[PDB]
Amino acid sequence: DTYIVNMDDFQFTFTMEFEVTVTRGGVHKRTISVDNGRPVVVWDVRDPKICKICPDVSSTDIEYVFLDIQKMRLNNLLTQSLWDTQRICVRYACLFLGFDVICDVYHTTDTVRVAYTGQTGKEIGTYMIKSNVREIKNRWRSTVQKLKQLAYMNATEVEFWYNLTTCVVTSRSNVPFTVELSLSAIVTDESTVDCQILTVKAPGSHAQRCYVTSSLGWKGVVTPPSQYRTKRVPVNI
Ligand SMILES: *[C@@H]1O[C@H](CO[C@@H]2O[C@@H](C)[C@@H](O)[C@@H](O)[C@@H]2O)[C@@H](O[C@@H]2O[C@H](CO)[C@@H](O)[C@H](O)[C@H]2NC(C)=O)[C@H](O)[C@H]1NC(C)=O
Ligand SMILES: *[C@@H]1O[C@H](CO)[C@@H](O)[C@H](O)[C@H]1NC(C)=O
Numbered sequence: 001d002t003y004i005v006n007m008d009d010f011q012f013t014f015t016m017e018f019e020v021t022v023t024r025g026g027v028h029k030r031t032i033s034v035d036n037g038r039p040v041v042v043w044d045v046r047d048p049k050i051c052k053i054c055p056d057v058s059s060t061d062i063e064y065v066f067l068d069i070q071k072m073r074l075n076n077l078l079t080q081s082l083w084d085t086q087r088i089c090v091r092y093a094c095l096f097l098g099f100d101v102i103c104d105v106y107h108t109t110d111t112v113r114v115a116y117t118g119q120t121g122k123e124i125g126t127y128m129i130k131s132n133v134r135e136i137k138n139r140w141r142s143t144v145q146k147l148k149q150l151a152y153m154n155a156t157e158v159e160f161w162y163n164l165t166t167c168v169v170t171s172r173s174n175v176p177f178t179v180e181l182s183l184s185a186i187v188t189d190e191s192t193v194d195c196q197i198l199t200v201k202a203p204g205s206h207a208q209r210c211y212v213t214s215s216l217g218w219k220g221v222v223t224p225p226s227q228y229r230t231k232r233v234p235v236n237i
Contacts, residue, residue: 009137014144015095016136018129020067022074023087030067032057034144036093037174037215040193043067051174051193053146055139062132063139066092070125085109092125099133101126151175153212153220153234160210161226166201167210170231175216182209182223 017033030043040051041063050057057064074088082088087110094103103126105116116123121130129136149155151173159168169179172195179187179198188199200210209223212234220234 005138009134009141010098012137012141012145013095013097014137014140015093016140017091017093018063018067018070019089019091020070020074021087021089022071022078024078025086028071030071032063032067033174034140034147035175037147037176038191038196040143040147040174042193049193051143054143054193061139062128062135066125066128069128082109084111092129094126094129096133096137099137101130101133103129147173147175148216151177151214151216153214153218153236156212156214156220156234157231158210158212158222158234159229159231160222161229162206164201164203165205165207165225166199167222168197168199168229169210169212171196175214177212177214177216180211180213181205181207182211183207 015035017036019031019033021029026045028045031039032041033039040054041057042049048057070090074090077088078085089108091106092103093106094101101121103119103121105119105125107114119126121127151171155172157170159166165181167179167181169177171177174196177198179200181200181202183202183205185200185202190197208225209221211219211221213219219237221237222232222234
């Protein structure tokens with residue numbers, strides 16, 4: 001019931017990263033990521049791409065409005081007084097602890113990098129986030145818990161075969177991870193708001209192990225290479 005949801009909203013700790021990039025020539029981008037992972041919501045230069053297990057983000061939701069305001073702010077900075085730069089980016093990296101928030105705020109231009117660390121909003125930018133912590137946590141908690149579980153080793157799919165050895169690792173989480181062969185390699189990182197597909201191929205390789213290392217704090221192995229492309233899960237090693 002509502003009572004228990006409230007307590008869980010408070011107790012669950014996580015981070016959200018809001019980022020906006022504005023470039024001279026009309027190319028902008030707004031994104032939301034959680035737990036310092038890949039973006040789960042992307043607005044490209046329309047409607048955003050929103051991860052399937054993400055809450056809906058309408059034009060009036062706090063997340064959308066925060067990013068919209070930052071975008072307008074950055075446009076102003078370019079037009080007003082930043083001609084020594086072709087682009088500007090702002091990033092709010094916020095920790096939601098209880099109903100408190102600590103954000104590190106980063107601004108980047110061609111020649112200048114700025115960081116305001118440890119902002120609590122108690123500077124205006126963080127204030128808006130701080131003032132809406134309960135709503136944000138309530139909206140995102142379930143999404144963030146699922147994203148962690150989807151990052152588990154046993155939710156990770158691995159196609160490790162030989163034709164020329166290839167290892168394709170698929171994850172439905174935004175949690176970062178790396179894929180390494182037991183070896184000259186080619187590494188491909190394809191990602192959408194919904195999944196990550198990391199492929200490592202080494203031509204003329206007879207590597208017998210494909211390792212998967214997760215930011216979540218785990219490492220697993222798939223071995224030996226198949227002759228066919230079939231999905232398996234990494235084994236703790
Ligand atoms: C899937 O695996 C998890 C445990 O996976 C490990 O721990 C994760 C935190 C992550 O680091 C993974 O990559 C690791 O491989 C299972 O969850 C555990 O289940 C046991 C008993 O079943 C329980 O005592 C633990 O508390 C659980 N771990 C936690 C804290 O989540 C989960 O059951 C597995 N799911 C399936 C389908 O088997
Ligand atoms: C396997 O080799 C064949 C040609 O012999 C090629 O068409 C195919 O793309 C290869 N598959 C992989 C996994 O590289």
